[PDB]
Amino acid sequence: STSPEIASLSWGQMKVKGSNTTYKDCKVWPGGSRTWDWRETGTEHSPGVQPADVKEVVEKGVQTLVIGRGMSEALKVPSSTVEYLKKHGIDVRVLQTEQAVKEYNALVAQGVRVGGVFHSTC
């Protein structure tokens, strides 16, 4: 449905207005959110963010997708992963988390269909 608000962000913890839970790492999109457990894809800081990590977001319907790659971006992001999104007409924003949530919510403020995945730590 609509894009929620990321209420709060601190090391290893994030808050999304609308969720009965504050996760560690998370996924957000018009309609809701969800815990982002790398194990579901066995994702590590390398190869890094996998298309499988953000597909569930893409299949929800977003114009822009924001990737929170951590507080130091120690987690890389495959270029094939970004092109993958762009190949779907999606605007991609790759940022350090603290700054990543700032773009996300801003977009949320101007009512854009935005989604994303965030790494609350490094």
Side-chain angles (χ1 to χ4, degrees), residues 51 82 102 106:
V82 175
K102 177 167 288 181

Side-chain angles (χ1 to χ4, degrees), residues 49-112:
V49 189
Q50 278 281 295
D53 282 303
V54 297
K55 183 167 184 175
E56 161 193 39
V57 176
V58 181
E59 57 192 56
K60 286 292 178 177
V62 302
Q63 323 170 199
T64 278
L65 193 158
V66 184
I67 294 173
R69 62 192 302 182
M71 313 303 229
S72 74
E73 314 175 310
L75 163 57
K76 295 170 65 178
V77 170
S79 71
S80 78
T81 291
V82 175
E83 293 305 313
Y84 157 67
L85 297 179
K86 294 200 177 185
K87 185 188 178 67
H88 291 195
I90 300 179
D91 173 56
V92 183
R93 307 293 184 66
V94 180
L95 307 160
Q96 177 265 344
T97 301
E98 296 268 307
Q99 304 179 50
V101 172
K102 177 167 288 181
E103 247 303 311
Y104 175 76
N105 284 316
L107 291 171
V108 174
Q110 65 185 68
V112 176

